[PDB]
């Protein structure tokens, strides 16, 4: 019975870019997923199709825990049916999603004074990104129909901004680390099971 | 580390004909999905179908086929080294090399994409004739 | 639906010199699946790039993936004598069922 690695995931000493979210397997394993839903440091905690207090006794194919840093504003962009930049551009889930999202504060952790510039947020994209797709190109964005060739100006703006996160920004300017457990059960042996 | 294709053969008009991918080195665990790609004589490659590596043995489940080979074609995990393709009503256009593959996907909610192939079979050849 | 246009069908170069082989999509590709392979005759198809720019473990870094969105592009950058053969490209859109193959191209070694 060993235990999966949700340590890995939720205590990691970085988190990635929302932009380039980083994405890890969970499978054959068991799972507790109380030490999840018990902790009071959670600031959001919210399940689509599952029950966050029954989940160890549910058992499941494949779970798939997407990291990365938004803003603290943007937290609401990470659900299903939203809009904004991060859904829009950066982090979308498709409208039947089946896990959970968790976010907290994550200001003593991802705040630099001065400013860290390590996190980023991608600005604008010719279209929507589809469910779960991943865009990490930095190609300069060309806005009009004058080519860009590797130099940014009028209308060739550089697709990714620096969130810059300072510990004195306000609460919803401040960085917040955010996980999504997708939970995905196959009519295959189950390889990830709670407690029972 | 090695996929090795069998049961390609010289079959006539109509017939129908169960190609074999044998894993070599590991069992199959969950961890990807194999699939079969074909190639007819001096021509490019064409997906066929994938399946989920982990299924239960004898399962034709968790399984994806291209438009013009669903139904005609079978995709099954019967062992945790062994996957098969069955194709029925063969015709002189199914004469290709048929390559087993394993297939690196990703999870996008209620299905998977394939991201790439990295592994490949030297391939078993279906010889459609009379 | 979803076709990749790869052209030209064949490209030559002298050892040393650089063939560029593109890659066109007629919608984009999802995540930036796009995939090269090479295949030399009577081998199976063998992966140089996945992701339109992540180099496969052992395959020299003279193959080298570009490209975003709907244009990619397959660069051999010093073209050895070996690597007379055939190239492919692959994508993968927002689908379960559908992963084209592009027509092929031939690599001439000058001499």
């Known amino acids: 019975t060993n235990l999966c690695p949700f340590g890995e995931v939720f205590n990691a000493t970085r988190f990635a870019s929302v932009y380039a979210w980083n994405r890890k397997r969970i499978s054959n394993c068991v799972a507790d997923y109380s030490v999840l839903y018990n902790s009071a440091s959670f600031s959001t905690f919210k399940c689509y199709g599952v029950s966050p207090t029954k989940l160890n006794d549910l058992c499941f194919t494949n779970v798939y825990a997407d990291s990365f840093v938004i803003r603290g504003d943007e937290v609401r962009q990470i659900a299903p049916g939203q809009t904004g930049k991060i859904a829009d551009y950066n982090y979308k889930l498709p409208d039947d999603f089946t896990g959970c999202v968790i976010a907290w504060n994550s200001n003593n952790l991802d705040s630099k004074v001065g400013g860290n510039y390590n996190y980023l947020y991608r600005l604008f994209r010719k279209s929507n990104l589809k469910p779960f797709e991943r865009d990490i190109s930095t190609e300069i964005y060309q806005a009009g129909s004058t080519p860009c060739n590797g130099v940014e100006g009028f209308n060739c703006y550089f697709p990714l901004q620096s969130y810059g996160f300072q510990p004195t920004n306000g609460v919803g300017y401040q960085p917040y680390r955010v996980v999504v457990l997708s939970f995905e059960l196959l009519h295959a042996p189950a390889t990830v099971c709670g407690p029972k | 580390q090695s996929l090795e294709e069998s049961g390609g053969d010289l079959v006539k008009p109509g017939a129908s004909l169960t190609l074999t991918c044998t894993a070599s080195?590991?069992?199959?665990?969950?961890?990807?999905?194999m699939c079969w790609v074909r190639q007819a004589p001096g021509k490019g490659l064409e997906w066929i179908a994938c399946?989920?590596?982990?299924?239960?043995?004898?399962?034709?489940?968790?399984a994806y086929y291209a438009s013009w080979a669903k139904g005609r074609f079978t995709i099954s995990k019967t062992s945790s080294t062994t996957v098969t393709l069955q194709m029925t009503s063969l015709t002189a256009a199914d004469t290709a090399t048929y390559f087993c593959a394993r297939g690196v996907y990703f999870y996008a909610g209620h299905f998977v994409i394939m991201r790439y192939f990295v592994l490949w079979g030297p391939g078993t050849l279906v010889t459609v004739s009379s | 639906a979803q076709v990749l246009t790869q052209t030209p069908s064949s490209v030559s170069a002298a050892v040393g010199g650089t063939v560029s082989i593109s890659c066109q999509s007629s919608?984009?590709?999802?995540?930036?699946?796009l995939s090269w392979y090479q295949q030399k005759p009577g081998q199976p198809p063998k992966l140089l790039i996945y992701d339109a720019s992540t180099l496969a473990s052992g395959v020299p870094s003279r193959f080298k993936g570009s490209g975003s969105g709907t244009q990619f592009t397959l660069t051999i950058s010093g073209v050895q004598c070996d690597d007379a053969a055939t190239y492919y490209c692959?994508?993968?859109?927002?689908?379960?069922?559908?992963?084209?193959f592009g027509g092929g191209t031939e690599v001439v070694v000058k001499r």
């Open positions: 080195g590991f069992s199959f665990s969950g961890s990807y999905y």
């Open positions: 919608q984009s590709v999802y995540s930036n699946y």
């Open positions: 692959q994508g993968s859109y927002y689908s379960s069922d559908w992963y084209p």
């Open positions: 399946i989920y590596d982990g299924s239960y043995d004898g399962s034709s489940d968790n």
